[PDB]
Amino acid sequence: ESILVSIWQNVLGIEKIGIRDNFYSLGGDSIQAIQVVARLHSYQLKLETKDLLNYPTIEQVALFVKSTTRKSDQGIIAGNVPLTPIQKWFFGKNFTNTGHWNQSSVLYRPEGFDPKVIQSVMDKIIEHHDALRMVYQHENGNVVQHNRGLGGQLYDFFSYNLTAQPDVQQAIEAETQRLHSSMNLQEGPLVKVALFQTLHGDHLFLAIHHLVVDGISWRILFEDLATGYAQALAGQAISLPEKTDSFQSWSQWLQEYANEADLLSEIPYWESLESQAKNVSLPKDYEVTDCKQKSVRNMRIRLHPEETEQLLKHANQAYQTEINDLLLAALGLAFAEWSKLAQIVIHLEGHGREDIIEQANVARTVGWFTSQYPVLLDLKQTAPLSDYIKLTKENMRKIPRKGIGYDILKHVTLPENRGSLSFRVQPEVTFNYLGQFDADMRTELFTRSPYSGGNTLGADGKNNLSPESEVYTALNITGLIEGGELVLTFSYSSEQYREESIQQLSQSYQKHLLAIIAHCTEKKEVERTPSDFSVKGLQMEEMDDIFELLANRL
Amino acid sequence: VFSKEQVQDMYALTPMQEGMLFHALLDQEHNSHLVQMSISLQGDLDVGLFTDSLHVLVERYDVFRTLFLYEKLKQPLQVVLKQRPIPIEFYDLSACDESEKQLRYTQYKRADQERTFHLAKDPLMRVALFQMSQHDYQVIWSFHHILMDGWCFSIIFDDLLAIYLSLQNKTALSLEPVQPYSRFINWLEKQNKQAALNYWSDYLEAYEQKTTLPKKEAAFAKAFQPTQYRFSLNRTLTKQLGTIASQNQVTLSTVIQTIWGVLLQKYNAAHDVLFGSVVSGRPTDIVGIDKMVGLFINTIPFRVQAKAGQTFSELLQAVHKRTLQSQPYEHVPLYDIQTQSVLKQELIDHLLVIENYPLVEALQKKALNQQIGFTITAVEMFEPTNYDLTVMVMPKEELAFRFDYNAALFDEQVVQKLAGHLQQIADCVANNSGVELCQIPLLTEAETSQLLAKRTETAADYPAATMHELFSRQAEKTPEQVAVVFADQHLTYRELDEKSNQLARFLRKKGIGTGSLVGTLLDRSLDMIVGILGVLKAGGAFVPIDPELPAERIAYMLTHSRVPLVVTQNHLRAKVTTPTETIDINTAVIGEESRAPIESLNQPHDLFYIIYTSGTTGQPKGVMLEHRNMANLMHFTFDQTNIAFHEKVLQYTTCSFDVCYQEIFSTLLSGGQLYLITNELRRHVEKLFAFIQEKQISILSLPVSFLKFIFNEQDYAQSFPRCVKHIITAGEQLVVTHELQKYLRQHRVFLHNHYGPSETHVVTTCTMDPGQAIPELPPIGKPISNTGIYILDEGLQLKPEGIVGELYISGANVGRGYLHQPELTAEKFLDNPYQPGERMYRTGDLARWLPDGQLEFLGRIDHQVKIRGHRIELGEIESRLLNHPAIKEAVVIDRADETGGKFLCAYVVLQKALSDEEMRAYLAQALPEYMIPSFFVTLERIPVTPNGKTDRRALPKPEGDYVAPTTELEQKLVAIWEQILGVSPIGIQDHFFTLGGHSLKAIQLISRIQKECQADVPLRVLFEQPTIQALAAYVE
């Protein structure tokens, strides 16, 4: 390539270098190679000098020139998509009426939301993001995903005027309740859209089957919708950001990664977990083994805005925890008081996307990446609160790759690789902490409809899971910040637990979380723990030795 | 006071910092580990802003605020502090005497080079400023090696000047973010360790014998004294090497490394040599690593190996490819690479370092790039240096070399010559790229002419008459005297002459003469000397045979000789089963021959004498001397030996071996008297010494086995004769026992040691010992008149004094060749390459010139044992065994297992029974564990050939190491050993590095000790005595 010739000329100094002259014959060395590569990368081309030396001719090294950044395939893509771990989990959980398992929101726009504009935007949205096209065929009694092309019928659309009814909220609620029943997973759009007109402005309902979307994917979809509507209002060509690596390729690289020995290196950790979790259990107010979503009840507890700001700004520093570490330590103490169990296991939803494949960028990728892993919280030594928060901090750091590996081993690694793993601990309890709501209210061009209804993104959403679906987890605990306050939601099945026992559990949570926020804000020093320092396998028994030796030496 | 707030970070040490922490903990004769950049600045310099800029430089780089903590840890750590100011001493001397100022400055600068950093307790930099005038400042900036590669200083000084400029111009710092050394640590933990150890174990695989350079002296003391020498190649020779490199597709560093390779080959025997190469160790895979301040510089083994037919270009290609294949793995620490090798340590003992950019010049150009008020006017550097030798090369305009060397170990003449040879190699390589490695000469004209002068010196002019003509001209001098006595019967010289004339006149009637040869299968008698001399006067060559030989071997020798005629006694006529005429020497017709002198009818040039050697051929082969060969020896023996003339000589060597005829002609032509002795009496030392003393014999000649052994036969050695004045010996590597020492010292017998292939003569060099002082392994001495002697390599090239090579022998002693199987002759016999017109014989011996001009013998080229990387002189182990009071006679051999794995074993005969350890300890007093024999075999008698040489064939095959007992007393160290080593239960006398320990696990060991107990022990202890029992001196 001419660029590479030009670098050789203006680095080796010799002019007129031929297309296959020899780097060592021209007088290169371990330094002229560095000068070539450093110069070359200015053109965004990359070349390890190992290749420049080993293939010391222009004609031979050019076969190893690369672009520094990959261009992710922005084309239209289609075809077979392997199940990801969470999709395989979904089909393996085998709900009744799987065609009604959704996420949604209701948007609002005071000045109106003209149907043709939002239609054109959703069209471009579904042209752009491929995974929203998939269908799930139940071929041969197994399941396979087909990523459809642009063969029309991207999404179902509906439009309504509610001004004839005074109680517009009830009408829009009942209609969105209707739409949730209509996901033809084998053949049809997985995105449903409805627009409700009203004198106070237009309301826009989005609903999407959960198999193809996620909270991060909703933040993306909203800000892309905002920029798309800005383009449509400006009348310019709707032109979304550069497509990041499409979910098909993520599924492929994951299936490839799922059999690498790298993941299997985690296997002794998850074994050391499961071999200890063997006798994990959770009590029930009544002996029952299945429930339906209509049996689920939820209740909320709040901290005051002052305590929420203290938790957000000051409670972390005293231990270099992050927010998750404190909420989860409080959950540990809550169960330690309420259950009086020696141990408990909690399942957490990571956002996935854990940089598992170095060439994979998914920052703009719509899909269901939610990655589930169990964690065992120790409850035996709750007395020294100074240490319980340290212990919980460290266990959260021992989890490899923040837990993306475990459900690959459960669902995708070929079963000879996955060793002794039993996979027979189940999510009786789960905890998650969302960010702020600001993923929804991210922009002023439109906002959350005051008639939001039961159609929230969160597990407090009423309509988005079908009333006949089975309750897959007994306690679902989610935290979020709104109005400047932390809101905790506890979900339970009315047939497994009664109201008084969840009022107990939720107060025994609020108590210990306020205790922890006070304790850690009052502590004015900073302490640190072995995970802070960058010494592999350093321990409390050793870090406080090193800090003893320094204090003695100096 | 300390607070936990202050620590920024911790790390495990990188392999380089691990190695340098070990090094810094090892030594305490000095702890000079340091660098002292010393920079002279003229002009205007605001010392306040300089101070500030140094404080901002120490804040900028985390590696300058690093401290290394190891005192009690499982594993050394870097601890990085958030704040740690460095000392900045300042001394305004501008008001001081020019006579004082330079002294005060020099005294300080030299004192600072002595001020050792404490790797934990002190900041690892200093700066000092001396203001010498209104516009003159000198900076001293000592720092520790462990902080950074010294060349990193070019970065640090650039940042420092940028900071100073920013402060002077009140302008924001433009410096980029620091490329953090932790970025490389991550990459070191990402990399697969075992793939690289499994490569380096392959690279070293066949490394049979360690490289050497001629160290002057043993480590009698750590008299280390850092010394230097430097030189450079001419402009043209350098750009010629550049042309070679650019034509061969290799770097100039590869050409330089190959030239140093070929040099180390020619300086050794080997075709396979390994030395340390120092490489930047910065993996190009890292982003920005060429700006990363830290410790990267690494030592790798570099191996150059050649085929015999390989051109230098073909070695260039091979060493280039071997370098590229190594590059992915050059970050591995040498302490682990050494563990991959059968040389578990001492794999490398000198370095070749190539540096395209020295720090001076590079630094000396910097401040010229900035408008600041001062100019850096000079710079110096100082670096205490590890190795005994280090060849720096700077590929400057004139390719310049420098040998940093410890002059306590290399003589300046050794290094001066080494640089001469290194230039002569480079010139040969530079003129023809395609010369064979065998054909490159090391020697300049000044050495070539000086060695060849040893042929032209000790030339001598002699009458070169025929051997029987010399006898006749002697016999006319004193014919009436008794020449020979056998049993109790004697002949005069007259009677010997008359009988020889009679027998020669008779033998000529059988056609014997110039075209003819005679077999002389005669047993010892007066008739034997008469027989020889008569056959000589018959003018044909005489072919003696030992009656004690196998009849099949006798018949082989006869038929292969094509001998028509055999002379014997009557009883031997049955031995001659061959179709050959057999003459009774007693036949009365010989009494009728005319007794007056027979005419001399063959000439000194013609064939004379033939005997049959052993060898690698299953057939014995006959080597034939010409008369000129013995005549040349006789005149030298008269001219230049202390052997007395009118003297009585014991004949001992049997007629099958040429020293017999060294006895015979040397006795007769000196006019002495041959005392013959009956064949078997050689078996009866109690009768030999009785005869010698009762006959008052004045001269003896003894095989080497007689000297080694019979003087330890205490009852007889304490009864040894004292009438003897001179002893002659030859045939085997001579060894003098402590008993033989005491006897020679008391009796002051002149011992003469002679050497020769027999294919010339078993004398062609000699030395002689007045009994005043005697080495344990005497040399084989000087060449002799009209003998040329050369130590050559496989190319027939001369090789320098002090280097080993093939001992070619030349001049008047060189025989005609082989009587039959003459097709072998052209392999062994050739013209002297350096001087046509002289014959030369290719001895299979190695030898070395000693600087005093004596010649050293090194055994056969086939037997260079090179056990487990090391060469061994078996004579040293033999010396130690033979000087044991219990051992009478002993031998050592390179045996091998039935897989072909060589091992040392000893064959021994003793005055008492004793345990294996009762001699093994007696060796361990002095001999390294690569050269103590693995097994000891007890025998009744060592097999000897009647020539007296030991026989490797007749000793029995062996039957059936460091292994040691678990003689536990306290397990504490054993538990420490077991937990660190993990590989085995540990013997209390067992060896840490033999157990697979290495330099760094030794520090892990001691750091464990000094926490698991309130104990300490200097690291050198674990290298002086690498055993658990070594710490018995330290537990209390």
Ligand SMILES: *P(=O)(O)OCC(C)(C)[C@@H](O)C(=O)NCCNC(=O)Cc1ccc(C2=C3CC[C@@H](OC(=O)NCCNC(=O)CCNC(=O)[C@H](O)C(C)(C)COP(*)(=O)O)CCC[C@H]3C(C)=NN2)cc1
């Ligand atoms: P291209 O090939 O040109 O290279 C790329 C560039 C960009 C040029 C890059 O390399 C660069 O910028 N250049 C850097 C400088 N020049 C070079 O090219 C490389 C170079 C480095 C250093 C020098 C000089 C040296 C050599 C450095 C030191 O060498 C030395 O003796 N080693 C340190 C001593 N420490 C040890 O203990 C040895 C290593 N550890 C061991 O394995 C020991 O054997 C143990 C510890 C005993 C093992 O324990 P146990 O298991 O046995 C110091 C010597 C001399 C210096 C000096 C003064 N001059 N330069 C030159 C070039």
Ligand SMILES: Nc1ncnc2c1ncn2[C@@H]1O[C@H](COP(=O)(O)O)[C@@H](O)[C@H]1O
């Ligand atoms: N005095 C001696 N010292 C050392 N080696 C000798 C001596 N005499 C003979 N040899 C060696 O033995 C071989 C010749 O043996 P021979 O021809 O039987 O004397 C050659 O390898 C010689 O180098």
